[PDB]
Tab-separated table of C-alpha atoms and ligand atoms in Angstrom:
chain	number	residue	atom	x	y	z
H	1	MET	CA	-0.005	-0.006	0.013
H	2	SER	CA	3.044	2.425	0.229
H	3	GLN	CA	2.743	3.435	-3.484
H	4	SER	CA	-1.060	3.941	-3.183
H	5	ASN	CA	-0.567	6.041	0.001
H	6	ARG	CA	2.108	8.208	-1.755
H	7	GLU	CA	-0.351	8.862	-4.673
H	8	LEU	CA	-3.086	9.716	-2.131
H	9	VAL	CA	-0.785	12.295	-0.468
H	10	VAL	CA	0.133	13.926	-3.818
H	11	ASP	CA	-3.536	14.037	-4.874
H	12	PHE	CA	-4.710	15.689	-1.587
H	13	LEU	CA	-1.827	18.241	-1.563
H	14	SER	CA	-2.322	19.086	-5.283
H	15	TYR	CA	-6.035	19.612	-4.634
H	16	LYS	CA	-5.443	21.759	-1.508
H	17	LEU	CA	-2.761	23.951	-3.169
H	18	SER	CA	-5.041	24.479	-6.253
H	19	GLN	CA	-7.963	25.447	-3.879
H	20	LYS	CA	-5.589	28.211	-2.445
H	21	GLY	CA	-4.648	29.462	-5.974
H	22	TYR	CA	-1.331	27.556	-6.319
H	23	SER	CA	-0.428	25.035	-9.074
H	24	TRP	CA	1.759	22.048	-7.961
H	25	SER	CA	2.171	20.332	-11.352
H	26	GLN	CA	3.198	16.684	-11.458
H	27	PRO	CA	5.956	15.623	-13.913
H	28	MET	CA	3.812	14.078	-16.655
H	29	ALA	CA	0.804	16.437	-16.319
H	30	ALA	CA	1.577	18.547	-19.452
H	31	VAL	CA	2.379	15.313	-21.403
H	32	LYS	CA	-0.975	13.740	-20.399
H	33	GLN	CA	-2.854	16.889	-21.442
H	34	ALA	CA	-1.031	17.242	-24.738
H	35	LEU	CA	-1.697	13.556	-25.575
H	36	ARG	CA	-5.427	13.868	-24.773
H	37	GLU	CA	-5.638	16.910	-27.090
H	38	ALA	CA	-3.508	15.250	-29.830
H	39	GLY	CA	-5.647	12.097	-29.828
H	40	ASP	CA	-8.839	14.133	-30.142
H	41	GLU	CA	-7.403	16.122	-33.052
H	42	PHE	CA	-6.017	12.970	-34.740
H	43	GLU	CA	-9.408	11.238	-34.588
H	44	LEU	CA	-11.134	14.326	-36.090
H	45	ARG	CA	-8.447	14.911	-38.787
H	46	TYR	CA	-7.936	11.282	-40.037
H	47	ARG	CA	-11.304	9.552	-39.774
H	48	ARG	CA	-10.884	7.262	-42.862
H	49	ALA	CA	-7.238	6.295	-42.267
H	50	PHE	CA	-7.910	5.767	-38.532
H	51	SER	CA	-10.895	3.500	-39.377
H	52	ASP	CA	-8.615	1.454	-41.675
H	53	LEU	CA	-6.143	1.047	-38.753
H	54	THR	CA	-8.749	0.126	-36.107
H	55	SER	CA	-10.369	-2.402	-38.533
H	56	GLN	CA	-7.075	-4.474	-38.357
H	57	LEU	CA	-7.768	-5.880	-34.804
H	58	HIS	CA	-10.766	-6.895	-32.659
H	59	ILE	CA	-9.707	-8.065	-29.201
H	60	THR	CA	-11.596	-10.879	-27.400
H	61	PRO	CA	-10.753	-12.627	-24.124
H	62	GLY	CA	-8.731	-15.241	-26.079
H	63	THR	CA	-6.476	-12.736	-27.924
H	64	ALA	CA	-2.681	-12.878	-27.250
H	65	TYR	CA	-0.343	-9.834	-27.134
H	66	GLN	CA	1.379	-11.114	-30.315
H	67	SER	CA	-1.798	-10.215	-32.347
H	68	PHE	CA	-1.625	-6.623	-30.999
H	69	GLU	CA	2.230	-6.366	-31.543
H	70	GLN	CA	1.896	-7.573	-35.118
H	71	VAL	CA	-0.687	-4.905	-36.030
H	72	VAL	CA	1.155	-2.128	-34.216
H	73	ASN	CA	4.526	-3.236	-35.695
H	74	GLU	CA	2.977	-2.460	-39.141
H	75	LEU	CA	2.266	1.106	-37.981
H	76	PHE	CA	5.988	1.431	-36.987
H	77	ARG	CA	7.502	-1.019	-39.511
H	78	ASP	CA	9.813	1.539	-41.149
H	79	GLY	CA	10.269	3.650	-37.990
H	80	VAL	CA	8.724	5.999	-35.487
H	81	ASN	CA	7.446	9.564	-35.711
H	82	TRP	CA	5.240	11.483	-33.285
H	83	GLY	CA	2.212	11.203	-35.546
H	84	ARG	CA	2.453	7.403	-35.416
H	85	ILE	CA	2.789	7.590	-31.614
H	86	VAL	CA	-0.458	9.547	-31.446
H	87	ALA	CA	-2.011	6.955	-33.802
H	88	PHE	CA	-0.862	4.211	-31.383
H	89	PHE	CA	-2.559	5.837	-28.393
H	90	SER	CA	-5.786	6.549	-30.382
H	91	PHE	CA	-5.708	2.924	-31.661
H	92	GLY	CA	-5.525	1.559	-28.126
H	93	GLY	CA	-8.312	3.938	-27.072
H	94	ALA	CA	-10.551	2.612	-29.880
H	95	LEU	CA	-9.834	-1.017	-28.862
H	96	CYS	CA	-10.879	-0.142	-25.296
H	97	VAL	CA	-14.094	1.560	-26.474
H	98	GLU	CA	-14.929	-1.468	-28.643
H	99	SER	CA	-14.278	-3.726	-25.607
H	100	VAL	CA	-16.672	-1.828	-23.395
H	101	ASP	CA	-19.291	-1.609	-26.244
H	102	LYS	CA	-19.185	-5.521	-26.370
H	103	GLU	CA	-19.528	-5.857	-22.524
H	104	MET	CA	-15.844	-6.973	-22.196
H	105	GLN	CA	-14.784	-4.026	-19.840
H	106	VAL	CA	-12.439	-6.663	-18.328
H	107	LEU	CA	-10.120	-6.327	-21.449
H	108	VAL	CA	-9.415	-2.570	-20.905
H	109	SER	CA	-6.657	-3.271	-18.282
H	110	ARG	CA	-5.157	-5.951	-20.556
H	111	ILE	CA	-4.972	-3.505	-23.493
H	112	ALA	CA	-3.461	-0.910	-21.114
H	113	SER	CA	-0.704	-3.440	-20.196
H	114	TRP	CA	-0.123	-4.285	-23.875
H	115	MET	CA	0.246	-0.622	-24.721
H	116	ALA	CA	2.716	-0.092	-21.815
H	117	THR	CA	4.735	-3.089	-22.976
H	118	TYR	CA	4.867	-1.830	-26.506
H	119	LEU	CA	5.976	1.604	-25.286
H	120	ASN	CA	8.714	0.003	-23.190
H	121	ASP	CA	10.032	-2.225	-25.953
H	122	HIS	CA	9.672	-0.080	-29.128
H	123	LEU	CA	8.814	3.523	-28.473
H	124	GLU	CA	10.598	4.764	-25.316
H	125	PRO	CA	14.053	4.097	-26.907
H	126	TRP	CA	13.074	6.297	-29.910
H	127	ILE	CA	11.526	8.955	-27.671
H	128	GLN	CA	14.743	9.234	-25.570
H	129	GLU	CA	16.768	10.006	-28.815
H	130	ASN	CA	14.171	12.413	-30.288
H	131	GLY	CA	13.770	15.091	-27.622
H	132	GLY	CA	11.662	13.266	-24.992
H	133	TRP	CA	8.001	13.756	-24.171
H	134	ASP	CA	8.844	17.406	-23.582
H	135	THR	CA	9.492	17.757	-27.352
H	136	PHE	CA	6.052	16.134	-27.994
H	137	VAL	CA	4.437	18.726	-25.646
H	138	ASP	CA	6.195	21.625	-27.509
H	139	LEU	CA	5.149	20.190	-30.962
H	140	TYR	CA	1.469	19.123	-30.032
H	141	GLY	CA	0.476	20.832	-26.691
S	1	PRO	CA	8.600	6.689	-45.637
S	2	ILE	CA	5.185	8.394	-45.854
S	3	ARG	CA	2.462	5.680	-45.512
S	4	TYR	CA	-0.290	7.456	-43.511
S	5	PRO	CA	-1.777	10.955	-43.645
S	6	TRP	CA	-0.393	11.720	-40.158
S	7	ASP	CA	3.136	11.153	-41.486
S	8	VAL	CA	2.964	14.279	-43.716
S	9	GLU	CA	3.329	16.718	-40.813
S	10	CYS	CA	6.607	15.079	-39.513
A	1	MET	CA	10.438	5.885	-17.832
A	2	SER	CA	8.365	2.567	-17.785
A	3	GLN	CA	6.234	3.708	-14.732
A	4	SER	CA	5.639	7.190	-16.342
A	5	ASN	CA	4.665	5.583	-19.674
A	6	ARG	CA	2.197	3.166	-17.836
A	7	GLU	CA	0.555	6.200	-16.100
A	8	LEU	CA	0.364	8.003	-19.509
A	9	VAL	CA	-1.472	4.990	-20.994
A	10	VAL	CA	-3.977	4.802	-18.105
A	11	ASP	CA	-4.603	8.562	-18.294
A	12	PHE	CA	-5.264	8.531	-22.100
A	13	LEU	CA	-7.504	5.416	-21.957
A	14	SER	CA	-9.457	6.786	-18.939
A	15	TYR	CA	-9.969	10.065	-20.804
A	16	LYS	CA	-11.038	8.337	-24.056
A	17	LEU	CA	-13.466	5.928	-22.344
A	18	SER	CA	-15.028	8.865	-20.382
A	19	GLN	CA	-15.413	10.839	-23.668
A	20	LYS	CA	-17.459	7.822	-25.018
A	21	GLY	CA	-19.687	7.712	-21.858
A	22	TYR	CA	-17.782	4.928	-20.011
A	23	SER	CA	-16.163	5.174	-16.533
A	24	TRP	CA	-12.863	3.237	-16.058
A	25	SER	CA	-12.249	3.997	-12.381
A	26	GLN	CA	-8.755	3.565	-10.990
A	27	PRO	CA	-8.324	1.782	-7.588
A	28	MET	CA	-7.810	4.784	-5.318
A	29	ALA	CA	-10.141	7.227	-7.176
A	30	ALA	CA	-13.026	7.064	-4.661
A	31	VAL	CA	-10.505	7.284	-1.763
A	32	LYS	CA	-8.899	10.406	-3.286
A	33	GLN	CA	-12.323	12.022	-3.769
A	34	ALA	CA	-13.556	11.158	-0.280
A	35	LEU	CA	-10.360	12.524	1.306
A	36	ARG	CA	-10.606	15.814	-0.678
A	37	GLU	CA	-14.230	16.232	0.539
A	38	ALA	CA	-13.324	15.183	4.141
A	39	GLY	CA	-10.459	17.668	4.368
A	40	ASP	CA	-12.667	20.510	3.120
A	41	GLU	CA	-15.383	19.640	5.690
A	42	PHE	CA	-12.792	19.251	8.491
A	43	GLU	CA	-11.296	22.682	7.793
A	44	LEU	CA	-14.799	24.269	7.804
A	45	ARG	CA	-16.010	22.373	10.943
A	46	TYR	CA	-12.920	22.761	13.218
A	47	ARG	CA	-11.372	26.155	12.440
A	48	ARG	CA	-10.102	26.912	15.999
A	49	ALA	CA	-8.809	23.414	16.820
A	50	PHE	CA	-7.199	23.097	13.352
A	51	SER	CA	-5.474	26.505	13.849
A	52	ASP	CA	-4.070	25.258	17.199
A	53	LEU	CA	-2.698	22.164	15.385
A	54	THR	CA	-1.172	24.059	12.411
A	55	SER	CA	0.423	26.627	14.847
A	56	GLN	CA	2.627	23.748	16.249
A	57	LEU	CA	5.012	23.620	13.166
A	58	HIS	CA	6.466	26.040	10.575
A	59	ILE	CA	8.703	24.245	8.088
A	60	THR	CA	11.812	25.976	6.617
A	61	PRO	CA	14.499	24.521	4.361
A	62	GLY	CA	16.511	23.483	7.466
A	63	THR	CA	13.673	21.496	9.184
A	64	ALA	CA	14.237	17.716	9.748
A	65	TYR	CA	11.532	15.023	9.525
A	66	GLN	CA	11.858	14.444	13.303
A	67	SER	CA	10.227	17.902	13.915
A	68	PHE	CA	7.214	16.848	11.756
A	69	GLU	CA	7.021	13.296	13.368
A	70	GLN	CA	7.085	14.774	16.866
A	71	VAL	CA	4.135	17.096	16.193
A	72	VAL	CA	2.114	14.440	14.322
A	73	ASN	CA	2.908	11.803	16.989
A	74	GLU	CA	1.060	14.097	19.460
A	75	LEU	CA	-2.060	13.950	17.216
A	76	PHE	CA	-1.827	10.117	17.362
A	77	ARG	CA	-0.204	9.693	20.776
A	78	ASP	CA	-2.978	7.561	22.291
A	79	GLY	CA	-4.010	5.970	18.975
A	80	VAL	CA	-5.571	6.410	15.562
A	81	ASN	CA	-9.102	7.192	14.400
A	82	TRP	CA	-10.304	8.352	10.985
A	83	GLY	CA	-10.908	11.908	12.218
A	84	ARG	CA	-7.228	12.171	13.213
A	85	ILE	CA	-6.235	10.763	9.786
A	86	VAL	CA	-8.230	13.556	8.112
A	87	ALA	CA	-6.588	16.046	10.496
A	88	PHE	CA	-3.162	14.688	9.398
A	89	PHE	CA	-3.916	15.252	5.711
A	90	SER	CA	-5.357	18.732	6.355
A	91	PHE	CA	-2.305	19.555	8.532
A	92	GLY	CA	0.112	18.599	5.719
A	93	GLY	CA	-2.022	20.615	3.266
A	94	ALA	CA	-1.729	23.701	5.536
A	95	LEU	CA	2.057	23.268	5.813
A	96	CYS	CA	2.270	23.176	1.996
A	97	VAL	CA	0.129	26.292	1.631
A	98	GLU	CA	2.273	28.113	4.185
A	99	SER	CA	5.408	26.992	2.246
A	100	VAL	CA	4.123	28.399	-1.053
A	101	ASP	CA	2.913	31.631	0.705
A	102	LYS	CA	6.572	32.126	1.920
A	103	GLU	CA	8.052	31.442	-1.605
A	104	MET	CA	9.405	27.999	-0.494
A	105	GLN	CA	7.387	25.939	-3.130
A	106	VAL	CA	10.490	23.659	-3.077
A	107	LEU	CA	9.368	22.270	0.391
A	108	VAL	CA	6.015	20.911	-0.930
A	109	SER	CA	7.598	17.677	-2.282
A	110	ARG	CA	9.553	17.261	0.986
A	111	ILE	CA	6.342	17.543	3.048
A	112	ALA	CA	4.650	15.066	0.640
A	113	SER	CA	7.547	12.568	1.324
A	114	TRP	CA	7.235	13.140	5.071
A	115	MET	CA	3.509	12.486	4.969
A	116	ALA	CA	4.027	9.271	2.921
A	117	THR	CA	6.673	8.103	5.402
A	118	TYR	CA	4.387	8.745	8.347
A	119	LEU	CA	1.520	6.885	6.619
A	120	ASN	CA	3.866	3.918	5.985
A	121	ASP	CA	5.212	3.774	9.508
A	122	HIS	CA	2.195	4.667	11.710
A	123	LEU	CA	-1.089	4.772	9.862
A	124	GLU	CA	-1.189	2.048	7.199
A	125	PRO	CA	-0.866	-0.689	9.865
A	126	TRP	CA	-3.938	0.702	11.716
A	127	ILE	CA	-5.853	1.203	8.464
A	128	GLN	CA	-5.310	-2.491	7.481
A	129	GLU	CA	-6.921	-3.619	10.823
A	130	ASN	CA	-9.771	-1.107	10.737
A	131	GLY	CA	-11.552	-1.832	7.421
A	132	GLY	CA	-9.133	-0.288	4.860
A	133	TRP	CA	-9.564	2.914	2.903
A	134	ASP	CA	-12.831	1.432	1.621
A	135	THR	CA	-14.241	1.804	5.153
A	136	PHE	CA	-13.095	5.446	5.149
A	137	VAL	CA	-14.924	5.979	1.815
A	138	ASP	CA	-18.152	4.431	3.251
A	139	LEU	CA	-17.884	6.551	6.474
A	140	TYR	CA	-16.799	9.953	4.791
A	141	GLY	CA	-17.453	9.735	0.965
R	1	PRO	CA	-9.320	9.208	24.588
R	2	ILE	CA	-11.165	12.295	23.274
R	3	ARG	CA	-8.673	15.163	22.896
R	4	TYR	CA	-9.899	16.988	19.740
R	5	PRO	CA	-13.342	17.948	18.478
R	6	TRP	CA	-12.936	15.580	15.474
R	7	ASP	CA	-12.605	12.629	17.924
R	8	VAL	CA	-16.277	12.958	19.072
R	9	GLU	CA	-17.678	11.464	15.855
R	10	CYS	CA	-15.562	8.242	16.128
T	201	LIG	C1	5.837	14.647	-36.551
T	201	LIG	C2	7.251	14.477	-35.972
T	201	LIG	O1	7.734	13.360	-35.649
T	201	LIG	N1	8.006	15.575	-35.963
T	201	LIG	C3	9.375	15.649	-35.554
T	201	LIG	C4	10.392	15.840	-36.750
T	201	LIG	N2	10.350	14.655	-37.623
T	201	LIG	C5	10.978	13.654	-37.330
T	201	LIG	O2	11.653	13.578	-36.290
T	201	LIG	C6	10.869	12.451	-38.315
T	201	LIG	C7	10.797	11.238	-37.708
T	201	LIG	C8	10.673	10.077	-38.392
T	201	LIG	C9	10.506	10.154	-39.763
T	201	LIG	C10	10.224	8.857	-40.498
T	201	LIG	N3	10.529	8.714	-41.748
T	201	LIG	C11	10.080	7.539	-42.186
T	201	LIG	C12	9.466	7.604	-43.557
T	201	LIG	O3	8.881	8.660	-43.871
T	201	LIG	C13	9.130	6.736	-41.277
T	201	LIG	S1	9.209	7.662	-39.742
T	201	LIG	C14	10.499	11.353	-40.432
T	201	LIG	C15	10.673	12.548	-39.688
T	202	LIG	C1	-14.275	8.212	13.293
T	202	LIG	C2	-13.883	6.742	13.230
T	202	LIG	O1	-12.687	6.370	13.409
T	202	LIG	N1	-14.901	5.868	13.164
T	202	LIG	C3	-14.725	4.414	13.188
T	202	LIG	C4	-15.211	3.762	14.513
T	202	LIG	N2	-14.371	4.206	15.627
T	202	LIG	C5	-13.294	3.694	15.853
T	202	LIG	O2	-12.857	2.737	15.112
T	202	LIG	C6	-12.448	4.248	17.044
T	202	LIG	C7	-11.119	4.297	16.782
T	202	LIG	C8	-10.231	4.802	17.713
T	202	LIG	C9	-10.716	5.308	18.869
T	202	LIG	C10	-9.713	5.955	19.827
T	202	LIG	N3	-9.933	6.004	21.080
T	202	LIG	C11	-9.005	6.745	21.690
T	202	LIG	C12	-9.511	7.666	22.713
T	202	LIG	O3	-10.648	8.181	22.520
T	202	LIG	C13	-8.007	7.511	20.750
T	202	LIG	S1	-8.426	6.885	19.146
T	202	LIG	C14	-12.050	5.325	19.159
T	202	LIG	C15	-12.968	4.794	18.198
């Protein structure tokens, strides 16, 4: 429970400081906000091409990570750019919405873990040589 | 290589 | 960066699911919300007694954790109850607001770490024998 | 033991 209790402390203090007119911003806050905004814009700019990407995979309780990695590896087959990273997040979002639509809310945490794995293995190493998430925020935030 | 419309901006 | 990237994934998916009318609630969300509400109510119910508690400590860059532990140990000297736990969070909040008022925003993360330590050492063991944070949420949420 | 007004409720 130590990690949970640390996150509870930071949430309460953030809330209290904001109530008194002070902003105590957490490290990834601007990255989270920029990615939310970038995904919304991506889904409104690229409806047809995004539909073609999301049509490549339908997750069920039986699906293995390899099925997800194969489809996402096609997105990145000839390398990474920030537009493809946004597409990756939007793609995972769409798989989660499909899951909940089909009464398989239980798959959302699995897709989350798959996306984290695929960040760890493929994307983080590119991000660390291309200006970090802070470059993303300056480009897209 | 450009394969998707989101690649154009990069 | 693996932990940060996992938190980015959960933030984006939570946001996207909420945009589509679905709630993907994180484990501590109801505890965070109940504690925010409990601290606000505590500070409005107990102004004089809370002022007497916050007057016991003024943190500066030189202050050691022992000074904080001694004052908080008085709050818990003869045991724990949920009202005293709320007082502890409100107390830390007030120390953080004082810090920012005095242009020592740098102390907020130190106070956060002190509060997490004091949860770990003193409060979590009581919480785990008294119904967990879920009992807090049922009592105060 | 009751020492603070917040203790009354517990
Ligand atoms: C949108 C973005 O990434 N902007 C940052 C500047 N551009 C680049 O860093 C960049 C990255 C990767 C590429 C790739 N080229 C190939 C084929 O087009 C696939 S990814 C281009 C530019
Ligand atoms: C407000 C709260 O904790 N409600 C849950 C039910 N009450 C208790 O669990 C409880 C806990 C601890 C005590 C203590 N007694 C002594 C002296 O009064 C100090 S803390 C009473 C009741």
